[PDB]
């Protein structure tokens, strides 16, 4: 809620207690779905927490921090006096004011983060804790966090490209709802959401995303399914970067027309492949770092990869 991003309103020393409204599995149950056996699990949940929007006045594009319960064995073993698990950040998935502008909740799209043969080797603490949440459970929350990855706060005529891998869809759920529905700003640009996931059933919120596309004309949904689609350029796996290339004219509308690219998801540093594809499109032959900083300087690139 309320515009103007605030950060670190809540920290480990003064956390925010949020109650679980819902935590539903978005992807097929393990063993079901396209992902084989080897190739681990892909268990992604939409977590809806009840929050006081006056206490937690988050902006879409920000992260919510979660402190998972318990002692961290690495910290006990290192003899820290800290010992509590460190915050894990999760992109907020819900629009600033919540769906329906109800100001009642916060949402997260959280993958089970495990290693995996296909059988579990190492279990992610916070992602699993979060995906294990039952209605009415209390989440220790931190933040809000981040003040870069944000939507325009004034009227915007520029085109916006949302570039997502997996859970990186999160900010763009809320961002798209906000831009198309909430109209906190007048948005007269085109949204292109490029959403990458390994399997079609590992893409989440698709009914909702396709629905936005059919309701608007303002909104284009493109998916890149890396283990089911080959790209036309080299026949390799389809990634959002290949979709970006396919969408050269839309990318050029953004490059030339003051629009924005938002890149969110994994793995860490995946924006590089995307940006350098945007760079090929622009015809710029400077260093990756020159082009990216230029774009960020121009407010035309926002990256949150992890
Ligand atoms: C700004 C930002 C936004 C984010 N947004 C989202 C989001 O929207 N949705 C989302 O799902 N995630 C998001 N993430 C990632 C999230 O914050 C966590 O990092 C993620 O959930 C994994 O945390 P974890 O506590 O579950 O795993 P951790 O316990 O911290 O470990 C990470 C990985 O290491 C493995 N591991 C554990 N022990 C070992 C060991 N012994 N040796 C080798 N490997 C080991 C685990 O299996 C796991 O796969 C975001 C991250 C950032 C920084
Ligand atoms: Zn609408």
Author numbering: 7 to 122, 125 to 314
What do the study's own words say?
Ferredoxin-NADP(H) reductases (FNRs) are flavoenzymes that catalyze electron transfer between NADP(H) and the iron-sulfur protein ferredoxin (Fd) or flavin mononucleotide-containing flavodoxin. Leptospira interrogans FNR (LepFNR) displays low sequence identity with plant (34% with Zea mays) and bacterial (31% with Escherichia coli) FNRs. Crystal structures of LepFNR reveal a typical plastidic type reductase, analogous in its folding architecture to the enzymes found in plant and cyanobacteria, in spite of displaying an important divergence at primary structure level. Overall topology of the LepFNR molecule has the canonical FNR fold, which consists of two well defined domains, although several unique structural features were found in LepFNR 3D structure.
The quality of the LepFNR crystal structure, refined to 2.4 Å resolution, is fine as judged by stereochemical and refinement parameters. Crystal structure analysis reveals that unlike in usual prokaryote FNRs, LepFNR accommodates the FAD molecule in an extended conformation between the two enzyme domains. The flavin group of FAD is tightly bound to FNR binding cleft through strong hydrogen bonds. The main chain atoms of Ser97, Ile115, Lys117 and Leu95 interact directly with flavin moiety creating the core of the binding site. Cys134, Arg94, Ser135 and Val133 are at hydrogen bonding distances to pyrophosphate group strongly anchoring it to LepFNR cleft. Adenosine ribose is also involved in strong hydrogen bond interaction with Asp119 as judged from a short 2.71 Å length of this bond. The phenol ring of the carboxyl terminal tyrosine (Tyr314) and the flavin group are practically coplanar maximizing π-orbital overlapping, as have been observed in all plastidic class FNRs, resulting in a large portion of the isoalloxazine moiety shielded from the bulk solution. Surprisingly, in LepFNR FAD acquired a different conformation in which its adenine moiety interacts with Phe130. LepFNR, on the other hand, exhibits higher sequential identity with plant FNRs and does not contain cysteine residues in the position required to form the intermolecular disulfide bridge. This analysis strongly suggests that metal mediated LepFNR dimerization, observed in the crystal structure, is induced by crystallization effects and do not represent a physiologically relevant oligomeric state of the protein.
